[PDB]
Amino acid sequence: TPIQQLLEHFLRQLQRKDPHGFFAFPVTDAIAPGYSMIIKHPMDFGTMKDKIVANEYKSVTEFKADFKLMCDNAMTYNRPDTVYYKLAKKILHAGFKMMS
Ligand SMILES: NC(=O)c1ccc2nc(N)sc2c1
Numbered sequence: 001t002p003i004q005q006l007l008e009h010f011l012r013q014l015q016r017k018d019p020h021g022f023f024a025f026p027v028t029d030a031i032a033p034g035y036s037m038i039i040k041h042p043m044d045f046g047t048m049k050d051k052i053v054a055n056e057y058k059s060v061t062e063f064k065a066d067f068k069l070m071c072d073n074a075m076t077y078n079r080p081d082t083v084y085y086k087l088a089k090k091i092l093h094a095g096f097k098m099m100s
Contacts, residue, residue, distance in 0.1 A: 007052045017091045043070040
């Protein structure tokens with residue numbers, strides 16, 4: 001569908017900004033201790049892709065909200081001086097601008 005095509009385009013462009021794949025897959029507690037205790041609504045680019053394919057996004061607004069959730073989670077869990085926090089903040093702002 002038109003929406004699925006646009007969201008696939010946005011997702012490709014957003015993922016290009018995360019070359020290490022820090023946000024490619026759900027965060028594991030092994031990698032990030034206590035993550036599942038701290039973050040109630042996890043999100044990641046892979047989950048977003050699956051939601052596109054399942055036709056679960058009915059508006060760009062819904063997709064943007066999941067992107068923001070992913071970034072907000074990273075800025076809640078990781079301390080500001082970490083690579084993960086800095087990239088989440090950078091890609092949140094740049095990603096919203098790109099989609100506009
Ligand atoms: N999405 C995240 O918040 C995230 C991703 C990767 C990662 N690697 C760590 N050692 S902490 C951590 C957190």
